């Protein structure tokens with residue numbers, strides 16, 4: 001089907017940088033993949049950042065002001081920077097196989113990110 005795995009807990013650095021991996025297992029023949037980071041507090045859901053990458057590549061597919069994502073095959077590293085204590089929360093990796101059809105979607109269990117000031 002579509003298992004998305006990410007580490008349950010991570011600690012931001014003193015500079016406000018937190019890194020976690022997100023990995024997927026699937027029967028789909030992934031080529032184009034959309035990875036979305038969702039911050040979740042119960043039913044409160046907010047999109048943090050998102051990027052598209054090509055499975056056969058190996059690159060830095062995401063680099064907005066806040067997230068940096070690198071990808072290799074079915075694994076990605078995600079890094080969120082500029083974190084402060086109030087940004088503490090559950091960050092859920094969502095993965096979509098976007099092309100070719102058929103479409104697949106999976107959601108991870110979430111990485112709880114703790115930030116000390």
Ligand SMILES: *[C@@H]1O[C@H](CO)[C@@H](O[C@@H]2O[C@H](CO)[C@@H](O[C@@H]3O[C@H](CO)[C@@H](O)[C@H](O[C@H]4O[C@H](CO)[C@@H](O)[C@H](O)[C@@H]4O)[C@@H]3O)[C@H](O)[C@H]2NC(C)=O)[C@H](O)[C@H]1NC(C)=O
Pocket residue numbers: 070071072075076077
């Ligand atoms: C997510 O982040 C982690 C942590 O930074 C990152 O892990 C790093 O991956 C690189 C590349 O796979 C690792 O370096 C390789 O592994 C060993 C180190 O002992 C070497 O044998 C390898 O050398 C070969 O490959 C090189 C090309 O990359 C050649 O230049 C070389 O001549 C050899 O042929 C290579 O150096 C590195 O060890 C890890 N770092 C850690 C701390 O684990 C991971 O890749 C990131 N994942 C994604 C999807 O971005």
